[PDB]
Symmetry: C3
Subunit: 107 residues, 3 copies
Amino acid sequence: SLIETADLRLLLTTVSTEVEAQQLAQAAVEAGLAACVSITPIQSCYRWQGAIARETEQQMSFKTTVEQLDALQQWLQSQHPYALPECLVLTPIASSVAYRDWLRSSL
Amino acid sequence: SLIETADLRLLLTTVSTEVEAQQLAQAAVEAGLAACVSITPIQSCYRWQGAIARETEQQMSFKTTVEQLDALQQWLQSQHPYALPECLVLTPIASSVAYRDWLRSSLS
Amino acid sequence: TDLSSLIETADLRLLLTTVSTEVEAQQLAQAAVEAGLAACVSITPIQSCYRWQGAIARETEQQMSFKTTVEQLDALQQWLQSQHPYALPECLVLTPIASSVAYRDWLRSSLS
């Protein structure tokens, strides 16, 4: 059954290469910063240093808790300190009982 | 025109194969439980069976109403190939008048 | 660091829509950034399933995500109505509840 959730978080960030995204995903799950991470290839168009840049990137979605969110975000940045990556956080408003428990238990 | 919305829902889950995702998408729409379903190939990383898994999967996003959400999650749980399905629901805070109307009308 | 710091945000918006082809998505993304209506637009290929004319349709499409502010959202949407290839576009808006300080600043500055 669905249950209201206010403690789960989805952190959305991007990295340039598939290799980095795979490495970051595995390491974040190993460190207990995220329970699950998805990687999706994307094209991004954005304003950069005055110009319009178009680039192939990897969109990452980290499934975590509010308790781990700050630490996860800091940690990701430490992995590419030269970068200014996307960093957006969503709050799911429901989940299943079982999926929320799994996610919490994972961390 | 943009309108504020409180009644629309996106339910996210994943399945293993494109075939599975297609069949599940079509059955949800035929059941009147979602107006539209998108499928996107992803790679997933999570801890399972004492190991770190990396699997190719299909991300699904079901577009529905709050009225249909419970019935959709129930039906998913019965039909879903995974022993623990992903289940995350987001609430859009705005849509267009036309698009909201289309979504709700599709689930009459 | 502003790169290392989350902050609570109520002013950012993600507008989600779809278009038929990669070419249309690339043109629309570029035009949107040039207009200053979005700071960043991402494009992802998807398949969509929905009922059309009474029957189930499956279509390949491009999912677009436009990163913008609440101040530009109304104009972005109005602009998309005029420029969008479909006569009834997908339009779903989400509100991120946090961001990094650096990303929020980059975003708001891009649309200033």
